[PDB]
Design a protein around this motif. Sequence first.
Motif, PDB file in Angstrom:
ATOM      1  N   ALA A 147      46.116  40.345  16.444  1.00 56.59           N
ATOM      2  CA  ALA A 147      45.910  40.016  18.734  1.00 56.59           C
ATOM      3  C   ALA A 147      46.227  41.214  18.813  1.00 56.59           C
ATOM      4  N   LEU A 148      47.525  42.196  18.719  1.00 62.75           N
ATOM      5  CA  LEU A 148      48.082  42.461  19.932  1.00 62.75           C
ATOM      6  C   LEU A 148      47.271  43.881  20.712  1.00 62.75           C
ATOM      7  N   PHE A 149      46.060  44.016  19.609  1.00 65.91           N
ATOM      8  CA  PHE A 149      45.539  45.149  20.465  1.00 65.91           C
ATOM      9  C   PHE A 149      44.152  44.444  20.978  1.00 65.91           C
ATOM     10  N   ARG A 150      43.992  43.591  21.253  1.00 67.18           N
ATOM     11  CA  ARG A 150      42.681  42.731  21.232  1.00 67.18           C
ATOM     12  C   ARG A 150      41.850  42.464  22.791  1.00 67.18           C
ATOM     13  N   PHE A 151      42.119  43.985  23.777  1.00 68.80           N
ATOM     14  CA  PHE A 151      42.315  44.133  24.846  1.00 68.80           C
ATOM     15  C   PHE A 151      41.658  45.991  25.469  1.00 68.80           C
ATOM     16  N   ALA A 152      41.180  46.369  24.104  1.00 68.09           N
ATOM     17  CA  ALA A 152      40.959  47.678  23.737  1.00 68.09           C
ATOM     18  C   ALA A 152      39.224  48.206  23.411  1.00 68.09           C
ATOM     19  N   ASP A 153      38.678  48.228  24.273  1.00 66.69           N
ATOM     20  CA  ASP A 153      37.405  48.201  24.514  1.00 66.69           C
ATOM     21  C   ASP A 153      37.100  49.674  23.273  1.00 66.69           C
ATOM     22  N   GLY A 154      35.514  49.293  22.814  1.00 65.31           N
ATOM     23  CA  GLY A 154      35.435  50.307  22.149  1.00 65.31           C
ATOM     24  C   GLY A 154      35.756  51.798  22.580  1.00 65.31           C
ATOM     25  N   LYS A 155      35.743  52.353  23.740  1.00 68.35           N
ATOM     26  CA  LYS A 155      36.236  53.738  23.485  1.00 68.35           C
ATOM     27  C   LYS A 155      37.928  53.987  23.382  1.00 68.35           C
ATOM     28  N   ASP A 156      38.902  53.124  24.029  1.00 70.31           N
ATOM     29  CA  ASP A 156      40.021  52.408  23.713  1.00 70.31           C
ATOM     30  C   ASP A 156      40.607  52.370  22.021  1.00 70.31           C
ATOM     31  N   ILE A 157      39.487  51.836  21.404  1.00 66.66           N
ATOM     32  CA  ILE A 157      39.276  51.386  19.861  1.00 66.66           C
ATOM     33  C   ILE A 157      39.286  53.252  19.326  1.00 66.66           C
ATOM     34  N   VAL A 158      38.429  53.659  19.544  1.00 71.34           N
ATOM     35  CA  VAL A 158      38.479  55.243  19.790  1.00 71.34           C
ATOM     36  C   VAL A 158      39.671  56.411  19.959  1.00 71.34           C
ATOM     37  N   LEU A 159      39.984  55.607  21.109  1.00 74.35           N
ATOM     38  CA  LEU A 159      41.528  56.364  21.074  1.00 74.35           C
ATOM     39  C   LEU A 159      42.587  55.678  19.437  1.00 74.35           C
ATOM     40  N   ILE A 160      42.212  54.729  19.593  1.00 77.37           N
ATOM     41  CA  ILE A 160      43.665  53.886  19.023  1.00 77.37           C
ATOM     42  C   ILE A 160      43.475  54.877  17.487  1.00 77.37           C
ATOM     43  N   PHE A 161      42.044  55.158  17.083  1.00 76.43           N
ATOM     44  CA  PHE A 161      42.062  55.155  15.340  1.00 76.43           C
ATOM     45  C   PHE A 161      42.204  56.860  15.535  1.00 76.43           C
ATOM     46  N   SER A 165      49.485  62.240  23.272  1.00 81.10           N
ATOM     47  CA  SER A 165      48.281  62.135  24.805  1.00 81.10           C
ATOM     48  C   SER A 165      47.976  60.961  24.176  1.00 81.10           C
ATOM     49  N   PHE A 166      46.736  60.459  23.458  1.00 82.97           N
ATOM     50  CA  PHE A 166      45.308  59.722  23.101  1.00 82.97           C
ATOM     51  C   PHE A 166      46.200  58.336  23.100  1.00 82.97           C
ATOM     52  N   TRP A 167      47.673  58.160  22.240  1.00 81.90           N
ATOM     53  CA  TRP A 167      48.370  56.750  22.301  1.00 81.90           C
ATOM     54  C   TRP A 167      48.399  56.565  23.866  1.00 81.90           C
ATOM     55  N   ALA A 168      48.957  57.324  23.973  1.00 79.65           N
ATOM     56  CA  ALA A 168      49.347  57.031  25.336  1.00 79.65           C
ATOM     57  C   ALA A 168      48.510  57.009  27.194  1.00 79.65           C
ATOM     58  N   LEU A 169      47.374  57.860  26.101  1.00 77.60           N
ATOM     59  CA  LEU A 169      46.462  57.153  27.415  1.00 77.60           C
ATOM     60  C   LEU A 169      45.763  55.798  26.763  1.00 77.60           C
ATOM     61  N   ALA A 170      45.619  55.482  25.653  1.00 82.00           N
ATOM     62  CA  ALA A 170      45.478  54.061  25.589  1.00 82.00           C
ATOM     63  C   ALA A 170      46.137  53.083  25.552  1.00 82.00           C
ATOM     64  N   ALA A 171      47.147  53.646  25.827  1.00 73.65           N
ATOM     65  CA  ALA A 171      48.498  52.732  26.420  1.00 73.65           C
ATOM     66  C   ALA A 171      48.431  52.511  27.390  1.00 73.65           C
ATOM     67  N   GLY A 172      47.442  53.540  28.458  1.00 70.64           N
ATOM     68  CA  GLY A 172      47.739  52.937  30.202  1.00 70.64           C
ATOM     69  C   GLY A 172      46.178  52.474  30.173  1.00 70.64           C
ATOM     70  N   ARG A 173      45.663  52.688  29.809  1.00 69.87           N
ATOM     71  CA  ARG A 173      44.404  52.190  30.310  1.00 69.87           C
ATOM     72  C   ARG A 173      44.088  50.596  29.531  1.00 69.87           C
ATOM     73  N   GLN A 174      45.266  50.084  28.145  1.00 73.79           N
ATOM     74  CA  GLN A 174      45.034  48.841  27.699  1.00 73.79           C
ATOM     75  C   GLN A 174      46.758  47.924  28.967  1.00 73.79           C
ATOM     76  N   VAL A 175      47.876  49.292  29.801  1.00 71.51           N
ATOM     77  CA  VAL A 175      48.177  48.362  30.779  1.00 71.51           C
ATOM     78  C   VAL A 175      47.304  47.976  32.060  1.00 71.51           C
ATOM     79  N   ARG A 176      46.655  48.865  32.304  1.00 68.35           N
ATOM     80  CA  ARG A 176      45.626  48.737  32.994  1.00 68.35           C
ATOM     81  C   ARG A 176      44.705  47.359  33.468  1.00 68.35           C
ATOM     82  N   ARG A 177      44.362  47.497  32.291  1.00 67.36           N
ATOM     83  CA  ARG A 177      43.324  46.456  32.046  1.00 67.36           C
ATOM     84  C   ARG A 177      44.135  44.672  31.691  1.00 67.36           C
ATOM     85  N   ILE A 178      44.855  45.185  31.312  1.00 73.75           N
ATOM     86  CA  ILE A 178      45.826  43.985  30.883  1.00 73.75           C
ATOM     87  C   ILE A 178      46.528  43.099  32.547  1.00 73.75           C
ATOM     88  N   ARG A 179      47.236  44.345  33.293  1.00 72.04           N
ATOM     89  CA  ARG A 179      47.073  44.330  34.637  1.00 72.04           C
ATOM     90  C   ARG A 179      46.047  43.183  35.170  1.00 72.04           C
TER      91      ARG A 179
END
Length: 898
Positions: free
Chosen positions: A8-22, A83-97
């Motif tokens: 449930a934690l990473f339920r706000f990651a979209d496609g490119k975000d999934i690729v980033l996380i992977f 870099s990738f993890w932080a960018l994923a974190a940033g995108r996730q946090v922006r979407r979360i906000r």
Amino acid sequence: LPMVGPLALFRFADGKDIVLIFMGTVMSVAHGAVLPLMCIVFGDMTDSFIKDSMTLQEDMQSFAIYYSIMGFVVLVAAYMQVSFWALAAGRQVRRIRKLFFHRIMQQDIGWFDVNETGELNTRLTDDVYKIQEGIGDKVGMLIQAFSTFITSFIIGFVKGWKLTLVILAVSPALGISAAIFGKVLTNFTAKEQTAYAKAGAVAEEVLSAIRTVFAFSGQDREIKRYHKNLEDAKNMGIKKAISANIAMGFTFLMIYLSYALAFWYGSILIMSKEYTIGTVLTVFFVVLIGAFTMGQTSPNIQSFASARGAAHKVYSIIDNQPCIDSYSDAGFKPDSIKGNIEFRNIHFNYPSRPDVKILNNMSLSVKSGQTIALVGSSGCGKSTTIQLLQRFYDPQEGSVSIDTHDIRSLNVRYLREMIGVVSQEPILFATTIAENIKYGRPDVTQQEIEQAAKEANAYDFIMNLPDKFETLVGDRGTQMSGGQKQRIAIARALVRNPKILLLDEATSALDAESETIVQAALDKVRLGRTTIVVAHRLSTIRNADVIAGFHKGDVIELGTHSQLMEKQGVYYTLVTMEDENVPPVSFLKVMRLNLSEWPYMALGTFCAIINGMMQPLFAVIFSKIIAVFAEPNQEIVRQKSEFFSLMFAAIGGVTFVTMFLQGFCFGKSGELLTLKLRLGAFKSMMRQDLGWFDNPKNSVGALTTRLATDAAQVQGATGVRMATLAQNIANLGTSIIISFVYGWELTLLILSVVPIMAVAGSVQMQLLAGHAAEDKKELEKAGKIATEAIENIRTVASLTREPKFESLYQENLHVPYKNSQKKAHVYGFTFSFSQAMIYFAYAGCFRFGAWLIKEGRMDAEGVYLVISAVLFGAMAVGENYAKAKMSASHLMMLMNRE
């Protein structure tokens, strides 16, 4: 408490975000295989040297290229991971906000009445920060350490059949130690909690009633009692520190016994030759690094746990959709409306306290162009009705008819947009006059803006504006006046000319001129407008054609005011009624505070010096262990390996004893220092006159917190800091001297790689590049604006500006979001650089040692001595000073003051 699963934690990651996380995951796995693999090549190199100690140039070149490629690959892998993890974190946090704010503005008012605004602000700030920090690097390193632990065991499976089980059979002993210490630790913590409880009790009693302390004048028994309590606290804290130091030393001793037992078992294998010495060293080092990594993962585990809890609460908010969604897209949205509004038997109860039927039987009707007012006692269902008409609350019973169409059927956006409401004490929004008026409508021009501004009779105060509407409102509306506040409010309400007005007490809390101006504005507005003014000022109420008395959310009387006076309804009653100075204090004076403790300081310094000396001894014994392993000489080598294993045990014992004495001595010294400083503080305070303690800096809670916190801080630091300085200086001096005696060229090489590593090390992690201040400040400012929006939720609704305040929120997020990306990039760069520096240093140091060997001025055993000793000195140097200095300055200023 409930906590959501990692799925449930990473339920706000979209496609490119999934690729980033992977990509982050695979890079982290590569990194966590490298670490143990780094140790693997390290042990292989160790064995190759052991055999080589008795095939040199080519072997060293191959090793060097392997190390260099390892450094490059770890550099790339780590840099990309961060870099990738932080960018994923940033995108996730922006979407979360964005989604969080979307739901918050979507949730009805009752949702806010349940969750206090301060709690929401704390959530949106701290919990968002927590989730950001967790996902960004903490999860990445968590996965990485998982992989390293797994790889250590696979490699121990490659050839460790015995060592793996031996080290696991250490695990019951290791846990026995960690838990036998912990059982005493809990009891000691309770005891010292009792001791500090008594100490703080005497402190609070004397300070809080310090006026009574002066009054009774009996500081004799109280001062002596303070001394007694402090002496008991000393008796206890000395033992506490002693016990903690014994715990640390026993941990060290268990580590060293494990070292020696593993080495003896390896010697047994070499006797049987079942395991080659190289294999044993490799497996031992790798299992040790894996175990230490697993152990030190705990802070990251706690970080993930905090992130998981924050995410649980946040997603609980997100998925808790309202009974009605303001952003709905269904309804009549009639092209026009006559305006009449009728309410029947309204029945609402707050979600927080759904146990008292506040609202009952509000049969009421308002006709277009009709002036009907509402008057009653405080909290008599006035504001609840106005909230309902904006569809803030669903009427459990009753009906809400707006000209043959209920609020239920009509859409929310459409309804709110054309309806005007003014609260009892409306509050301007944190924006200039321009924007504050633009909220009227988005399709507004300047000429009509000033027309509407003057429509509210506001003209009087615009010729004095420094910049007209461009004039800034001023912080918190400091440059503002209540009458003018109501003027801007009513103007921003009228600009769009809503069909119906609900002025909920929007006339009170003003001056005579202010009341006159608001009354004039209202009378001008009442021209051809359907109005419901629930106000306290008598002028408007009497001017109103029909008035309705009220009490406890109930209708009583309605009609001309004459009937109200005749019945003397509620209307008749309403009618009748610290860090700045922080002077640098000479360390000589601070140390001199331990006058009588000179023997204690000296003995502790001896203990610390011996302790610091030991570690170089560990390096030397390790080097000679390798040396003996070099020559086969099976009988001599087995005997000497046994000898140096017993020496390992001896080093464990000497570390244990030196920790015991150092802890005891420094605890006693620092605790006596605490007693002296506390007594001096009390004496100085009771010298200070009464007024001295009325300063806000001298509040009872603040002063006692200062007392306890600073006393503990100085006690720990003053003893710990000097001891640590001595230990580290011993380590550096002996290491450098050993290197210089061995050779002053490889010496300088080591002593240069060290500083470049440290400078590019932990300091860069949070200090260099100047991103921290700006990024934090901008985040705080954006959070403050969002918090203001949340606070004024009612007015934001009456404005129907939620989408636009969201837009501004994201706009001001944009720059801090970019700064977030920048800081992430630099963080990744420094982290990868730091990680790779280690490998490159290994390669260069070993290569230059080999070159010196070609000249013969050094031997491989010396090479191991220097490298291992310097590395261990670097690790030791890791083990506040500014806090101690400031606290000591505070106390010295307070005492020495006359």
